Structure formats: structure tokens, C-alpha cells
């Protein structure tokens, strides 16, 4: 068979973030990760030699990473968690009445329900997917694309679209 | 597409033990491996946040590996071995006569033909499966399991189940 | 020359904490790392074989790793951050009048003046010192220990101790 | 399901050369990678108890490593590459004009149009398919071979042949 | 002890070139290196709470790799090769009379004897010492710099200077 | 200062051995490891551009690890052990009676007290400072040789030698 896929990696393609998970009858307390970017592209070998330049894949996802790089991950989607903007901070208060307060500009909101790392891979595959361009991919007869993000180097999602 | 992936892979998930391969007209010499075990299941992010939670992942494998660690292992159904036990040893005989004697309670006695990483991984992933409980699976709509079993840092085997 | 060293490293001696830097004149935002700890010690080849058997080590890294792991590392000694403590919740006031607000319980309290890599390091290494029982070390006639503490797989600090 | 896959990867499978892309209005400048290739295939735990003995697959993969190793890589089916021999080098003239020289024994003459990972890949894999020799691995029942060949520890291409 | 050291290091910190090793009675065909560098430099915990800042060490060792990135590396100090210009084109004749020619452009001509990882060391170590600032270093008690130039994964060098 | 260092290490650099650990009091079962054996010379950049050539610190440690490789390592020294050569047997016989008996074939015979990794690095580095010749080390001014034998990747013994 005919189609070829290529692949980056490295602990450069990173961003470090504090977060906590809470979902229904669970939270924990608050603590942090270095999460690492990999990412997978299959397609063909095209007249230029590549399925497509690595330069590009490495400057995408490094575009992708530096927006999350060093903040409180929010999941604003989030079932169990309720948000609140007291003067220059976002207040969050758990099920459990708990409460934390951090500077707004401390947090990233990110259209997720969870801060685990499979729902955060599926909003980096998004934001990949926009930030490569859809039609630069079906031009080169790419037709998938898969991330992996480790939490650390024990532990890793893998998520994935066909196009 | 929606399924997603976790895995998770350490140093940690170890078993260090003596064997040696016999197939027909073939034995070597007794020696021994740190062999490393990592663990992939294909599901969805269900409500929690998860495919499943690496935690009981990370559980369920170190307790397979602390089984196994510390052992010459010994393939109960090979069909060059003949197998005595007198007093407290397992006496192995191979086809060329040769002898090998251990305390029983140094052997590890799988239901495998060869000792061989494919035939150690496959013992692998039936107990996992069994550990981490079938229905739980279905219930979180896990379809498919795959374990890594490396013998070293440069060869491994990969065997999986579609459940 | 006659003295030996003795080393253990893995991705399990880690702990997943928040933090932030804070000095005279610079806040940073918070996040967070895994913090990855290796410990050696050098000594001498005894009588039973070892310098010191890596189960100790192990088992030493590993309680203190698992104290930090999951929290806001709190710097007490910080010039540049004044703590309150009200209700359930410790406040911390910067420099430039920011303010955080942590349940009591998110956060390990270290008497550091800055969350850094360096004097996280130094925190272990006394722990780690006291842990494994300084007249052990002096029985066995080891005489240096060293830790590194990596915040990541790319930056890492390393401190030691002559006993 | 049945079928199983083993693997091989190590530092030691590498070949280390110079090379230099050029493509229709593209060219950079000479340069070199540590170019490392590992090599799967998917088959069935046989009689013997292997999908394929490991020893084969490394002795393959090294074969071919060695015969690469230590070249400028010339892709004599380039479109933008004129190749002429002049005593003992080869001339290679560029579209913008520029040329190389190097003595012919410094260059290995690979059938590809560009020494682009993805080609080189491409070369290895039909070369290791004619190493271990296609009958052998149908008696086997070896059915899928797939290798990667990284450029650098941060970028690779996979190419793959079902048989 | 009070001293402490900072190490960064990282796949990102490379340059891929091309060289050969020639000296008396010796010369090897042209091939290339991804060339790798980890930075160690030892002081102790200033008021800041470092030794020095990771993205100074981080932002030093890129600057320098990436003026060599993407070259043949030429020793313009060698004994036993001649450089000649001819037109846009850089000519080496060798002792046994053997002739490469490249654009000048495609050369980095650095002051050393010979292209080997030693001596490319010592040129960075050089290089590095002088982008950090011998005064900033100074000020900061940092008495010890070491770099690692790895040519693959398998063999490195190791400089150092006292200051 | 001018004094450099070369080292070489790769997961080729092994010996898959089986052994037990035993000694006054104490013995466990028969297990086994992957050793892994890296070298590290301190030496100076002579007139050829080396410490020394990273071809011969190869060549001279997979030799070493050639001989071990594939065998029960055996302890001659030890205070704990009786053995005895039972037809094509060796026979060991431990403080608690236990009993092995294995094909002489099988055994390596090491001059050490116990199978530790302090202690069978400590042989390897003897023997390595054998095959490299000591005087050939004088002449290049080869003054401290080190060696790291890993027993699994998470564990390892340093031992050196200053000649
Ligand atoms: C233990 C800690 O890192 C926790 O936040 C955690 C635990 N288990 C998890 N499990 C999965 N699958 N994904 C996660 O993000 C995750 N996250
Ligand atoms: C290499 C050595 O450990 C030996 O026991 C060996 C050789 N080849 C093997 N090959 C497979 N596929 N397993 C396994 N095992
Ligand atoms: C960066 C350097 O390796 C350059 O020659 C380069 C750049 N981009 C590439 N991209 C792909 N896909 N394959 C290559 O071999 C390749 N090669
Ligand atoms: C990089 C980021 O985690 C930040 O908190 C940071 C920056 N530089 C640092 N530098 C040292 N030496 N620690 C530490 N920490
Ligand atoms: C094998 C290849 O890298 C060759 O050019 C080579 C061989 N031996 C070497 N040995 C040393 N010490 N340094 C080198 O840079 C070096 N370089
Ligand atoms: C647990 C097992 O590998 C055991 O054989 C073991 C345990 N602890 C050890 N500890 C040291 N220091 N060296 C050893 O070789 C060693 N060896
Ligand atoms: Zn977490
Ligand atoms: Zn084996
Ligand atoms: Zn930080
Ligand atoms: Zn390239
Ligand atoms: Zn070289
Ligand atoms: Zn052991």
C-alpha cells in the first residue's frame, strides 16, 4: 500500500498548566503538568517528497502549545464547578463548596467539560486541524490526523479525525 | 471520528526473570530479561472526563507484573520439556537430555507452549482482561485492548483483543 | 580508586504539583510541572555486595515524592508573598496586589523562599537525608549524596551533600 | 483476535549521512542526519513461538543500515539534479546553477527522485522485504511490514507494505 | 556543601551537518550528524532562588546551534587539507588528492583542526561563554560551565572551563 | 582546564544474564536482568582530534559484554554458595539447602562474591581495562576510566578507576 504518514515529537512541544479534575461526586485537589504534543499525519508521498513539510506540523503545534503554556486550565463547559468574577479574579466554587480565586489572567478558558487530557486533546486536535488549514490538508490528500497528549511521561491520550 | 485512546507505559511495569526459549530441535541457555509492559485501550470520553482513569490502568498492570517478577518462568505446556517434581524442585528435562533443577517456589508456572514475548504477552493480556473485569469495558464501551511486552529496550511484541 | 555510586531514577519518583515563581520585582503566573526526583549515593562495596541496596533508595524516593504530589507548593519563608489563613482557605497577597486564594489542604507548605527547582531540590535532599537515617549512611561508610530534580524532561537541578 | 506484531528499534540502526533536498524551485543547503530506522511486522505466534525470530529482523535491518551508512545520499531519478562524472567525483549541477563535486566512493546513488525520510523509507523498505525474503516471511504467514525511519530524534516517516 | 548546578538539555538543541574527520595518514568520506548540546553550569542558589535562569541557558544554547544548523562544517585550522576559492565555490583537496567542492554557502568555517565532536565542543563551550556574559556569570558566582556534544545518541564529548 | 571527556552508550551495549542475589542471611530467587554497560573516558584532545577513537571504546565494550551475554552469571567467591560439578551439572547448594543444578554450559563463572551490579561492574571494568591495554591508555594520557552497568533502566552501579 501506498499511503505514508509522518511524524513530531518533542518535550518542546509542551505547555505547562496547573488544573484539577471534577466531575459528578469527585474533585481533587489542585496540582500541575507538563503536557506533550505529538502529532501524526497520513497522506502520500507528493511531487515536493513529502506527505508534507515537518517544518510545518513543528511550527503548528508549537503555535498551539504557547497559548496554554503556563496557566490554570478552566474547563468553562464544566457540570459541577460554578465561575464568578470578583474584581481582577475568576472565583470557582466546587459541589463540595470549596472555593479557589485566582487573577483572571492566570486562567485559560477552554470550551471543555473536563481538564483531563483526553478532552484537552480533542480541543489541540481542533485547534490544529483550523490553524494547518483544512484545504491545504485535502490538497495534499491528507485524510488523517492524530494528536497524543502525555500528562506526564507515564500517561497518554490519543485522539483522532478523519478527513 | 469520536473513539479515543489512553495508554499507559513506565519503567515501573516490570517483571525481571529468568527463562529460556525450547521449540523443536532448538534450546538455549538459561538467562534473563527486565521485561516492560505497556498497557492501550481504544473507548470514548464518557461523562467523567475519561476514556477510563490511567489510575486503574497503572493499578491493574503493576499487579499482573509483581506476579511474575522474581521467577524463572516455566511453559507448562511446552511439547519439549518433561517436568518432575521431586521434594521441593522442579526438575526440567529437554530433548537432548540436558537438566535443569530449581526450588518450586522459584518457577512461575504459565499455560503457555514457549517462553518466548509473544506467548508471555498474550498470558498478559488474558489476565489484564480478567483484572480489569469485562463488563466494566462494556460499560465504559472499551472495544479494544493492546499490550507492549518488551524482552529489552530494542525488541518487543504487541498482541491485542477487540472486545 | 575503590568507591562506588549507586543510582535510581524513574518516571514514578515524581510528584505533579502548581506553583509559581515569585522575587524582588517579578510574578510569574501559575502552573505547573512534573517534578521528576534521581537520588545517588556514593560509598563503598560491602560485605553483602552493595554500596546500599536499591530498595531502600527506592522506597526512601518514593515517600518523599508521594508528600508532594498534588498540591500548590506554598514557599513560607517567600520575602515577596504575605500568607493569610481565613476560614478554610490560605490567601496570598503579591507584590502588585494580586491575589490567590487556595483551600488550606491544595497546599504543601515548604519552608523555601522561592518554589524553584533549586530549593525544592535542597527540601528533598534533607528530607531524603533524614529518611534514609544519617548514622545508616555513616555504617556503610557512604560519604556523598546527590539529587537532581528535574521540573521537566529538558531542566533539571542538581544539589548534594558531603556527610 | 489472533494475529501479533514484534518490533525492533535501536541507536545502533542507523546510517549516518549527508544529503541535501531539492524539489521544482526548492533547494537548501548540504547538511546530515543520524538517520535511525526501526522495523514492525504483523503475523501469528507460530510452532516456535515467535511471529518471527527477533535475531532475523535485526540482522536485516542492520545489513541494510550498513550499506547507507556514511555516504552523501545522491537521488539519481531527481527532476532538478543534473549528475556528471568527472575523473573520480561526481558533479552535481542545481537549477539555480550551483554545483557540488564529491569523489564518486563518497556518494551512494539511491533510485529515488528526492532524499527526502519519506523515500529513503521507501528504498529500505523494499530493500528489507528482499532480505528476509518474501517466501520466508508467506511461510510465516506474515502478512503486513511497516518501518520508520527518523531523521532526527523529533521527526520521522512511516511507510509500510501489506504482503 | 552550598554549591548547586542547572543542566538544560533538549532534542531541540541541535545542529544537522555534514563533516569528515581528516588527520596525518587519515581521511573518511563525507557523511553527516545530528549534533546534539546539554548545558551544565554550577553556582549556588542566589537571592532569586536560582543558580541562573533555565531560559537564559535555553535561549544561549538555540542562538548557537542555530548559526551552525544546516552546514558542512569546515576546519579552517587543518593540517592536512587545503581551501581554495573558485568562483561562488569552496574547494578542499586532500592529501591523497581527492577534491571536494561546495558553494560558500553551504560552508561553516569554524576555527578548529579538525571537525571531530571534541573540538566542535571547545568551540561552543567558547561561543556560549562569551552569548552568557562572562561578568553576568560572575556576578552570579557560577564558577563551572560543562557542555555535552553528543554526534548521535551513542558517543559524546564532554568540555568544561573553570571561572 | 583542558582535560576532556568521551563516552559511548548504547542499549546494544548488554548482557541478558540471569542470577541471585545471595549473602549472609539473605537469598532470593533466580530472576534475571537486561545489564546495560555505558564507558566514559577522561582523557585530553591529542593531535588526531580525540580523546580517543569512540570506534575503540565500542569495539572493546561489545566485546565484554559479548562473553556474558546468555548465561547464569555465577559468583566463585561467594561465602554462601557450595557448588559442585555433577556429571554435566552444576550443582549449587545455599545456607538454607535450597538446591539449583544447571548445564555447566550455562554458567559463567565470574571472580566476584556476590552477583551484585557493584560487583559484576567492578569485573567488567577490569576486564575492559585489559582489552584497551593500559598502555596504550598512558600514551594518549588516559588518566580516570568509568563505567555504569545499569541492571534494569531504573537502577545502576557506577564504578572507575583513576590510571
Ligand atoms: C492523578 C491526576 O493527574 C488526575 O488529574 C487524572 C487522573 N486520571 C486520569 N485519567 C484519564 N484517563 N485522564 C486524565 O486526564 C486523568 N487525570
Ligand atoms: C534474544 C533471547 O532473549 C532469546 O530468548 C529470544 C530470541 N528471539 C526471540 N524472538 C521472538 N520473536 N521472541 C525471543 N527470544
Ligand atoms: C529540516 C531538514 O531535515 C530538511 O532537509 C527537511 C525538511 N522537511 C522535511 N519534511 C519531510 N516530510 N521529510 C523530509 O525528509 C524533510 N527534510
Ligand atoms: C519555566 C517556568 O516553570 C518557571 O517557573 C521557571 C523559570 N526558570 C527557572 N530557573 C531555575 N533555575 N529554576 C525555574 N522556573
Ligand atoms: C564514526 C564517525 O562519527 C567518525 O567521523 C568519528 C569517529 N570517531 C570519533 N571519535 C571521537 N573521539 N570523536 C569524534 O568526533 C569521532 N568521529
Ligand atoms: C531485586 C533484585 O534485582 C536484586 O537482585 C538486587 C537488589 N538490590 C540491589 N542493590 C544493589 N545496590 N545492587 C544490586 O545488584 C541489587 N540487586
Ligand atoms: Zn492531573
Ligand atoms: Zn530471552
Ligand atoms: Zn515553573
Ligand atoms: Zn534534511
Ligand atoms: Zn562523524
Ligand atoms: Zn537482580
Known sequence: ????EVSVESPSFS???AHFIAYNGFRETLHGHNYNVSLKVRGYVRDDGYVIDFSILKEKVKKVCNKLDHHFILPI???????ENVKNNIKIICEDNSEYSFPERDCIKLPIKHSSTEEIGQYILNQLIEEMDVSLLKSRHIHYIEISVSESPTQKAIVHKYI
Request: hydrophobic share 35%; aromatic share 22%; net charge neutral.
Open 1 to 4: 500500500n501506498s499511503s505514508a
Open 15 to 17: 505547555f505547562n498548566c
Open 77 to 83: 463547559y464544566s457540570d459541577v464547578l460554578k465561575f
